[PDB]
Amino acid sequence: MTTSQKHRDFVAEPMGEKPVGSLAGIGEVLGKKLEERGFDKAYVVLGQFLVLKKDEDLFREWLKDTCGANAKQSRDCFGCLREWCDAFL
Amino acid sequence: TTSQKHRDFVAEPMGEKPVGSLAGIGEVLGKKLEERGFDKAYVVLGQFLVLKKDEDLFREWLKDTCGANAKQSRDCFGCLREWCDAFL
């Protein structure tokens, strides 16, 4: 396993009301910027992932534009949502 | 109360179900949704979630997007709300 333990913890269970910082790749800096833009719970970011039809490029660009995520942070966030959806959606 | 279409939707993960599997989304509404990019139920779930599950704003969005009447939007909201309570 090459994912983080934080990715593994997120994809292991339904997300419920978990905050946005529970997503892999979303540290405190990115999480605050997301919260300032209304994306305060992980499920709101899932919503954007789903509205973008789970498209990696669109989602990772959206994350970049919205909170300034770098390539690794956006890859990690995407992969965490992608694997959560494969498990639970 | 609820339709069997609702109960069937809320009973299981939606996976790749088409948008027409959502309660209230019939053939006419589904066509309009697909034309606008909402071809699978999970894309409408996405909009529901981006709107923070807000009933008024989601039902208004659905009316504006595909022409859903009050009953159709009520049925579609309720099926997404109950699905989220079970699986999200």
From Swiss-Prot, chain A:
Query: Changing G25Q: reported impact?
Result: Complete loss of EMD binding and reduces dsDNA binding
Q: What result follows from mutating K64E? A: Enhances histone H1/H3 binding
Q: Where is the HhH domain?
A: 20-35
Q: Which residues carry this modification: Phosphoserine?
A: S4
Q: What is the effect of changing G25E?
A: Complete loss of dsDNA, EMD, histone H1/H3 and LEMD3/MAN1 binding
Tissue-level expression reads: Widely expressed. Expressed in colon, brain, heart, kidney, liver, lung, ovary, pancreas, placenta, prostate, skeletal muscle, small intestine, spleen and testis. Not detected in thymus and peripheral blood leukocytes.
According to the record, mutating C80A results in:
No effect on histone H1/H3 and LEMD3/MAN1 binding
- SUPFAM superfamilies (UniProt xref): Barrier-to-autointegration factor, BAF
Identify the disorder associated with this protein.
Answer: Nestor-Guillermo progeria syndrome: An atypical progeroid syndrome characterized by normal development in the first years of life, later followed by the emergence of generalized lipoatrophy, severe osteoporosis, and marked osteolysis. The atrophic facial subcutaneous fat pad and the marked osteolysis of the maxilla and mandible result in a typical pseudosenile facial appearance with micrognathia, prominent subcutaneous venous patterning, a convex nasal ridge, and proptosis. Cognitive development is completely normal.
What name does this protein carry? Barrier-to-autointegration factor
Taxonomic lineage is:
Eukaryota, Metazoa, Chordata, Craniata, Vertebrata
Gene that specifies this protein:
BANF1
UniProtKB/Swiss-Prot annotation, chain B:
In UniProt terms, what is the effect of altering K17A?
No effect on histone H1/H3 binding
The UniProt keyword set, sorted, is: Acetylation, Chromosome, Cytoplasm, Disease variant, DNA-binding, Host-virus interaction, Nucleus, Osteoporosis, Phosphoprotein
Q: What the entry says about post-translational processing?
A: Ser-3 is the major site of phosphorylation as compared to Thr-1 and Thr-2. Phosphorylation on Thr-1; Thr-2 and Ser-3 disrupts its ability to bind DNA and reduces its ability to bind LEM domain-containing proteins. Non phosphorylated BAF seems to enhance binding between EMD and LMNA. Dephosphorylated by protein phosphatase 2A (PP2A) following interaction with ANKLE2/LEM4 during mitotic exit, leading to mitotic nuclear envelope reassembly.
Name the consequence of R81E. No effect on histone H1/H3 binding
Please list the residue ranges annotated as the HhH domain.
Answer: 19-34
- Mutating R59E: what's the consequence? No effect on histone H1/H3 binding
Pfam families per record: SAM_BAF
Q: Give the consequence of mutating R7E.
A: Complete loss of LEMD3/MAN1 binding
Specify the effect of D8A.
Reduces binding to dsDNA, LEMD3/MAN1 and histone H1/H3. Reduced interaction with PARP1
> Which InterPro entries does this chain map to?
BAF (IPR051387), BAF_prot (IPR004122), BAF_sf (IPR036617)
Gene Ontology process terms (BP): chromatin organization; chromosome organization; DNA integration; mitotic nuclear membrane reassembly; negative regulation of cGAS/STING signaling pathway; negative regulation of innate immune response; negative regulation of protein ADP-ribosylation; negative regulation of type I interferon production
Q: What is the effect of changing G46E?
A: Abolishes homodimerization, preventing ability to cross-bridge DNA. Abolished ability to mediate nuclear membrane reformation at the end of mitosis. Abolished ability to outcompete CGAS for DNA-binding, leading to innate immune activation
According to UniProt, the tissues expressing it are described as: Widely expressed. Expressed in colon, brain, heart, kidney, liver, lung, ovary, pancreas, placenta, prostate, skeletal muscle, small intestine, spleen and testis. Not detected in thymus and peripheral blood leukocytes.
Describe what happens upon changing W61A. Complete loss of LEMD3/MAN1 binding. Enhances histone H1/H3 binding
Disorder: Nestor-Guillermo progeria syndrome: An atypical progeroid syndrome characterized by normal development in the first years of life, later followed by the emergence of generalized lipoatrophy, severe osteoporosis, and marked osteolysis. The atrophic facial subcutaneous fat pad and the marked osteolysis of the maxilla and mandible result in a typical pseudosenile facial appearance with micrognathia, prominent subcutaneous venous patterning, a convex nasal ridge, and proptosis. Cognitive development is completely normal.
Note what the entry says on domains.
Has a helix-hairpin-helix (HhH) structural motif conserved among proteins that bind non-specifically to DNA. LEM domain proteins bind centrally on the BAF dimer.
Please give the name of this protein: Barrier-to-autointegration factor
What is the species of this protein? Homo sapiens
